[PDB]
Amino acid sequence: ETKCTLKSFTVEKGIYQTSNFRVQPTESIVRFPNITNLCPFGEVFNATRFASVYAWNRKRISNCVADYSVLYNSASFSTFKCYGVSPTKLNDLCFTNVYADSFVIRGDEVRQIAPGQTGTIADYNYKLPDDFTGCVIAWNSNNLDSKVGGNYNYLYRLFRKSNLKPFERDISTEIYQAGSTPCNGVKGFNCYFPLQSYGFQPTYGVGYQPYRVVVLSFELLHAPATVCGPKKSTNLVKNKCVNFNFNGLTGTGVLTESNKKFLPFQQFGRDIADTTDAVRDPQTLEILDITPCSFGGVSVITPGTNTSNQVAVLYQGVNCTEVPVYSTGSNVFQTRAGCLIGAEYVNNSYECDIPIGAGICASYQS
Amino acid sequence: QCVNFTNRTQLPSAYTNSFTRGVYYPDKVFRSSVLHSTQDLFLPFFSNVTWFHNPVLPFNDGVYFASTEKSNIIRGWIFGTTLDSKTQSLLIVNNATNVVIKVCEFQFCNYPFLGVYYMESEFRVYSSANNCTFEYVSQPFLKNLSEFVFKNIDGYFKIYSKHTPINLVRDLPQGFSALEPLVDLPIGINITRFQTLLALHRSGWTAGAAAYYVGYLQPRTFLLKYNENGTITDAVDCALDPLS
Ligand SMILES: *[C@@H]1O[C@H](CO)[C@@H](O[C@@H]2O[C@H](CO)[C@@H](O)[C@H](O)[C@H]2NC(C)=O)[C@H](O)[C@H]1NC(C)=O
Ligand SMILES: *[C@@H]1O[C@H](CO)[C@@H](O[C@@H]2O[C@H](CO)[C@@H](O)[C@H](O)[C@H]2NC(C)=O)[C@H](O)[C@H]1NC(C)=O
Ligand SMILES: *[C@@H]1O[C@H](CO)[C@@H](O)[C@H](O)[C@H]1NC(C)=O
Ligand SMILES: *[C@@H]1O[C@H](CO)[C@@H](O)[C@H](O)[C@H]1NC(C)=O
Ligand SMILES: *[C@@H]1O[C@H](CO)[C@@H](O)[C@H](O)[C@H]1NC(C)=O
Ligand SMILES: *[C@@H]1O[C@H](CO)[C@@H](O)[C@H](O)[C@H]1NC(C)=O
Ligand SMILES: *[C@@H]1O[C@H](CO)[C@@H](O)[C@H](O)[C@H]1NC(C)=O
Ligand SMILES: *[C@@H]1O[C@H](CO)[C@@H](O)[C@H](O)[C@H]1NC(C)=O
Ligand SMILES: *[C@@H]1O[C@H](CO)[C@@H](O)[C@H](O)[C@H]1NC(C)=O
Ligand SMILES: *[C@@H]1O[C@H](CO)[C@@H](O)[C@H](O)[C@H]1NC(C)=O
Ligand SMILES: *[C@@H]1O[C@H](CO)[C@@H](O)[C@H](O)[C@H]1NC(C)=O
C-alpha cells in the first residue's frame, strides 16, 4: 500500500500515512414507551349484548393504542373480513380515529354487509359506501342471544319507501303505507309495521342463528392522529457501537450509562453545536450517554526498502482495545498517539529517528 | 339554562408593568451550563400588562395569564372563534376535583357561568352540544401567584404553568421564574378569541372580587442561560436596548 500511494518501487525511510480506519456498527435497537391505554374493544366485542340492526350501536374510538394482533389472531371470530386495508399491516397503518358499529343479524345476512350490496339489511337497516375502509367481524351468538322461547328483542327494518344512505340510522316508527290510503299512525288495510322482530331459537338451522357483527371504520381527518397500533420495542445493549432509534430519534454510536440529572419533563440532552449527547429510555427513564464510534488514520513506519521489508503500523488516536492481517501480529503497545503494532517498547533512550508522537519515536536495530 | 343579567358589571381595567416575567421552556431538550440563543414567540420585557378587578378578549399569537389568587374563585376558560353551535368551541373547567376539557359546538348565552348552589351542582354555561369529537379529563390543576401561558401551534394547544407563594401586596414582584410545560392537546381549532369563567354564588350572582393580569406575546429573539441542572435561571431580550 505504501508503494502504491507513493507511486514507486523504492521507499525511503520514514513514516507515511496511507488510509483510514473506522469501527463499524453491529446491530440495531429500538425502544418505545410502555404500551398503555388499550382501546376499549373487549367492552364492545364481548359485552352483555348488542343493539338491534336498525338501531346499531355506534361508538367513537380515539386516544388509545389499537392492538390488532390479538384481534386478528383470535380464533373465536366466525368471519374477519377487511376491505379497505390489509389486516396484517393494521398494526402499522393507522388513522386518526375509529368508528364501531355493533349489531345482531341472521346468519344468512352476514354477506349482506358489503359495499354495493342490496337487501333488507343492506338497504333498510344499514348501507356501506364502496369506498369503505376497515374491517367486519362476525361471530355466533346463538348460545347468547337466541332464546328457546323465541328471541324477540332484535328487530330489523323491513318496510321503507327508500333505501338508507350510507352511515345513517333510521329510528322512525312511522307506519309504512303500502297502498294509497293514508293511515292515522296504525296498521290497516294497506299499512304495516316497518320493523319486524326476529324469532331466534337455538333449534334454528344454519344461517338462522343470531350473529353479533361489529364493523370498524378508520378515518384520518387532518387533525393529529390519536389511534395507532402498538409499537414493538426491542432490548438495549450497552458498550457496543450500534445504531439506535430512541422514540423516533435515530443515531449511531456506543451507548453507555450516565449519571447526569435530567428534569422530570425534558427527554434528551445535547452539549454544543447541536449534537445529541444524552438520551432517556422511555421504558425505564434512565439517563444514557452516547459516544461516536472510533475512527482514525493509519500510518506505516518503514526503515527503507534498501534495508529491510518489515514495517510497523500505527492507528492514530484509537484505543488499544478494538484494533481488528495484523489483528494480533507482534506485541502491541498503547501510547497517547494511539496503538502501535509491530514494535516493542524498550527502556533505553536514544536520539529520535522516526518521529511518532507524544514524546516517543521508533527506529530500526528489528 | 343561563339567562340575562341586569347589573351590567364593569371591570376596572388598569395597566401595569410586565417586568421580566413569562419565560417558559421552549423545547424538551436538556442543556447544562450554557448560553443558548433562541428565536421564538415570547412576552417582551417591560411591557404593558392589563389588570382586571367576563370580558371578551382576543387571543392573538398567545396569551399570558397571571393571578395572585385567593381561594381560587376563578374556575374555567372558553376558547373559540364565535363561541356558538356554528363553530367548535373549546371549554376547560377546573373544580376541587378531577378537571375536565371538551371541544364542542357549545351554544353559550349572553352571560354564561357555572353558578354554585350551597352539595354544589350547577352547570349552565352552554345550551347545546350536538356535533363534537374530542373530550378529556385530567387531575386537578390548582394569596399565591399562579402563572399560565396558553398557545396554539399547528393543531396543538399548549398550556404551561407555574406556581409560587407570594407576600407582596398588589403588583408583580421583581423576580425570575421559568415556566415548565404542563399539558399538550393535539387538536386543531382556529382559536382566535377567548373568555374567562367565574364561580358566582347562585341561590343573585355575587362576583365582584375578580382581579387578574393578562398579556400578549410577540415573536422575537431571546438569550437563555442554563445552569448545571438544566433549569433556566436568566434571560436577555435581544431587541430591547443597544446593550442587550
Ligand atoms: C413499564 O411497565 C412495567 C411493567 O412491567 C413497569 O414496572 C416494572 O415492574 C416490574 C415488576 O414490578 C419491575 O421488575 C420493573 O423494574 C418495572 N419497570 C421499571 C422500568 O422500573 C414500569 O414502571 C413501566 N415503565 C414506567 C416508566 O413506568
Ligand atoms: C442542582 O440540584 C442539586 C440537587 O438538588 C443541588 O444540590 C443540592 O443542594 C442542596 C443544598 O445544599 C443539598 O441539600 C442537596 O443534598 C443537594 N443535592 C445533591 C448534591 O444531589 C444543586 O445545588 C443544584 N445546583 C444549583 C442550584 O446550582
Ligand atoms: C372477550 O372480551 C373480554 C373482555 O375483558 C376479554 O377478557 C376476553 O379475552 C375476550 N375473549 C376473546 C378475545 O376470546
Ligand atoms: C543501499 O545503500 C547502499 C549504501 O548506502 C548502496 O550501496 C546501495 O546501492 C543501496 N541500494 C539501493 C537499492 O538503494
Ligand atoms: C522499565 O523499567 C520499569 C521500572 O524499572 C519496569 O516496570 C518496566 O517493565 C521496564 N520496561 C521493560 C520493557 O522491561
Ligand atoms: C400602558 O398604556 C397606557 C395607555 O395605553 C399608557 O398610559 C401607559 O403609559 C403605558 N405604560 C407604559 C409603561 O408605557
Ligand atoms: C367536579 O367535581 C366532580 C366531583 O368529583 C366531578 O364531576 C369532576 O371532578 C368535576 N366536574 C366538572 C364538570 O367540573
Ligand atoms: C352534524 O352536522 C351535520 C351537517 O354536516 C348534520 O347533518 C347533523 O345533523 C349534525 N349532527 C348533530 C348531532 O347536530
Ligand atoms: C400557592 O401555590 C404554591 C405552589 O405550590 C403553594 O406552595 C402554596 O401553598 C399555595 N398557597 C396556598 C395559600 O396554599
Ligand atoms: C381555519 O381557517 C382557515 C381559513 O379560513 C381554514 O382553511 C381552516 O380549515 C380553518 N380551520 C379549521 C379547523 O377548520
Ligand atoms: C354589580 O356587580 C358588581 C361586580 O360584579 C358589584 O361590585 C356591584 O355592587 C353590583 N351592583 C349591583 C346593583 O348588584
Side-chain angles (χ1 to χ4, degrees):
Chain A
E1 281 185 79
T2 305
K3 279 173 189 178
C4 290
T5 69
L6 201 62
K7 276 186 76 86
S8 177
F9 275 45
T10 312
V11 173
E12 302 287 330
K13 140 196 177 183
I15 180 169
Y16 308 88
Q17 196 276 334
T18 76
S19 58
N20 303 272
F21 168 73
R22 319 186 305 105
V23 186
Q24 286 284 49
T26 303
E27 86 261 16
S28 309
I29 52 165
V30 65
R31 296 220 78 187
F32 281 140
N34 262 327
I35 305 179
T36 197
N37 185 13
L38 179 50
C39 290
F41 286 125
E43 62 157 58
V44 173
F45 291 164
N46 299 344
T48 304
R49 58 88 174 173
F50 275 15
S52 190
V53 60
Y54 77 101
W56 37 270
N57 220 358
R58 170 154 273 182
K59 184 60 175 291
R60 180 179 178 272
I61 304 300
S62 60
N63 177 321
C64 52
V65 57
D67 179 73
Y68 299 155
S69 77
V70 68
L71 264 62
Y72 183 76
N73 303 345
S74 185
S76 296
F77 298 142
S78 306
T79 284
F80 194 105
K81 292 178 178 178
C82 303
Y83 294 141
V85 292
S86 71
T88 55
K89 305 293 103 178
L90 268 171
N91 288 285
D92 292 331
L93 61 87
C94 59
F95 285 7
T96 187
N97 53 2
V98 192
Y99 278 125
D101 293 332
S102 55
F103 52 91
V104 167
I105 50 173
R106 222 165 53 74
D108 302 81
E109 318 198 309
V110 170
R111 51 97 177 167
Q112 301 186 11
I113 318 294
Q117 277 291 330
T118 62
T120 65
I121 312 298
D123 304 333
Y124 295 145
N125 294 262
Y126 192 85
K127 178 60 189 182
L128 270 181
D130 293 335
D131 55 81
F132 163 71
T133 177
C135 300
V136 173
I137 313 158
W139 60 85
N140 202 332
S141 66
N142 53 4
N143 46 6
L144 285 166
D145 287 290
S146 81
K147 195 177 180 67
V148 62
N151 190 6
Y152 299 106
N153 288 305
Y154 290 108
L155 289 89
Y156 71 95
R157 186 167 304 273
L158 186 53
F159 290 112
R160 183 170 140 136
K161 293 187 286 185
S162 297
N163 297 15
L164 275 296
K165 278 87 171 177
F167 308 130
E168 178 173 358
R169 179 203 276 96
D170 194 6
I171 51 173
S172 175
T173 71
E174 175 194 0
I175 303 307
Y176 174 57
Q177 179 203 308
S180 68
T181 63
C183 298
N184 63 7
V186 299
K187 73 163 84 49
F189 187 52
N190 284 327
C191 286
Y192 294 103
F193 212 70
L195 299 167
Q196 309 293 297
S197 60
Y198 268 110
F200 281 133
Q201 275 178 65
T203 57
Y204 273 19
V206 177
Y208 276 81
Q209 285 148 0
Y211 284 176
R212 289 173 183 203
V213 185
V214 176
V215 181
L216 295 186
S217 166
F218 298 95
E219 61 281 11
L220 184 60
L221 190 145
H222 62 57
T226 78
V227 180
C228 291
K231 305 188 298 179
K232 181 63 190 297
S233 53
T234 66
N235 297 83
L236 73 164
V237 298
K238 285 184 272 291
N239 311 92
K240 269 171 47 57
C241 165
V242 300
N243 45 4
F244 46 76
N245 195 353
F246 288 98
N247 211 342
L249 68 91
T250 75
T252 292
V254 58
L255 182 63
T256 180
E257 210 281 336
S258 64
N259 58 352
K260 288 184 189 294
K261 300 301 182 183
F262 270 27
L263 201 61
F265 67 97
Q266 38 194 4
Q267 293 317 104
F268 65 95
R270 62 160 47 110
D271 53 357
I272 197 166
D274 291 331
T275 59
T276 314
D277 202 1
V279 180
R280 187 178 67 189
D281 44 352
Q283 287 280 113
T284 310
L285 324 172
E286 293 297 321
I287 298 91
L288 273 54
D289 197 303
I290 296 90
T291 305
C293 304
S294 296
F295 71 95
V298 308
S299 298
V300 175
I301 300 107
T302 186
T305 312
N306 193 9
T307 291
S308 179
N309 281 334
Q310 49 179 347
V311 297
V313 174
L314 189 151
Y315 296 79
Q316 311 183 319
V318 168
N319 183 357
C320 195
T321 304
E322 46 270 12
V323 189
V325 70
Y326 279 171
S327 67
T328 301
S330 178
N331 46 6
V332 178
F333 194 30
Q334 152 69 59
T335 63
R336 298 293 182 185
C339 83
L340 192 63
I341 304 178
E344 69 164 294
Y345 178 72
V346 300
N347 267 0
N348 282 334
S349 48
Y350 323 123
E351 301 299 328
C352 190
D353 202 5
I354 300 182
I356 288 294
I360 77 162
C361 63
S363 175
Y364 185 60
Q365 293 299 109
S366 180
Chain B
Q1 198 199 351
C2 55
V3 292
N4 299 294
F5 69 105
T6 307
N7 177 32
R8 304 320 153 82
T9 184
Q10 191 46 236
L11 282 86
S13 67
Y15 284 60
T16 177
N17 189 24
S18 307
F19 298 99
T20 64
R21 309 209 55 79
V23 177
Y24 58 85
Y25 288 93
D27 49 9
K28 312 280 277 176
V29 165
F30 174 92
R31 292 178 180 99
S32 182
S33 289
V34 296
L35 272 67
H36 186 232
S37 167
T38 184
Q39 178 269 337
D40 204 356
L41 188 149
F42 293 94
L43 178 86
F45 273 18
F46 298 118
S47 182
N48 217 352
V49 60
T50 304
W51 183 25
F52 287 68
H53 316 112
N54 46 3
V56 176
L57 290 88
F59 192 83
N60 294 349
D61 301 305
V63 171
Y64 162 84
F65 179 107
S67 279
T68 175
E69 183 65 26
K70 285 86 70 176
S71 79
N72 308 322
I73 290 302
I74 201 166
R75 299 267 173 255
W77 277 270
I78 303 300
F79 292 71
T81 75
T82 57
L83 314 182
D84 54 354
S85 308
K86 268 71 70 179
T87 312
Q88 284 268 18
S89 79
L90 188 153
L91 187 153
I92 293 173
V93 170
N94 163 27
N95 64 356
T97 67
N98 217 9
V99 311
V100 68
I101 296 91
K102 278 76 69 177
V103 62
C104 293
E105 297 179 317
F106 295 130
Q107 196 45 56
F108 306 110
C109 57
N110 59 330
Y111 182 72
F113 62 94
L114 293 152
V116 292
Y117 288 8
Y118 294 167
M119 91 185 185
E120 186 270 323
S121 46
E122 183 43 54
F123 181 76
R124 51 188 172 182
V125 174
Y126 74 99
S127 62
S128 83
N130 53 1
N131 275 326
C132 58
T133 81
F134 174 80
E135 282 84 10
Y136 190 108
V137 182
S138 190
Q139 78 280 15
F141 280 7
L142 307 166
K143 166 58 206 306
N144 75 338
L145 196 50
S146 313
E147 301 192 86
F148 307 126
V149 169
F150 304 160
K151 292 214 299 202
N152 175 41
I153 288 298
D154 56 39
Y156 266 66
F157 200 94
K158 219 168 298 186
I159 291 170
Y160 297 167
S161 161
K162 184 64 183 293
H163 303 101
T164 300
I166 195 61
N167 58 342
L168 193 148
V169 188
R170 209 206 40 72
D171 214 1
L172 271 299
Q174 317 292 314
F176 202 112
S177 285
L179 267 66
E180 291 83 1
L182 198 70
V183 183
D184 181 278
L185 277 300
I187 302 96
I189 305 93
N190 273 358
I191 311 295
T192 52
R193 183 167 50 81
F194 73 101
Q195 280 278 98
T196 288
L197 275 297
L198 287 84
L200 56 87
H201 191 301
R202 182 71 69 190
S203 74
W205 43 276
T206 313
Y212 51 96
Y213 303 70
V214 176
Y216 286 70
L217 311 167
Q218 294 179 357
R220 47 187 53 247
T221 298
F222 274 52
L223 185 83
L224 319 164
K225 148 182 271 184
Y226 301 90
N227 64 336
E228 63 207 8
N229 287 339
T231 177
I232 293 179
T233 190
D234 208 1
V236 173
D237 188 355
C238 275
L240 194 80
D241 316 320
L243 177 58
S244 288

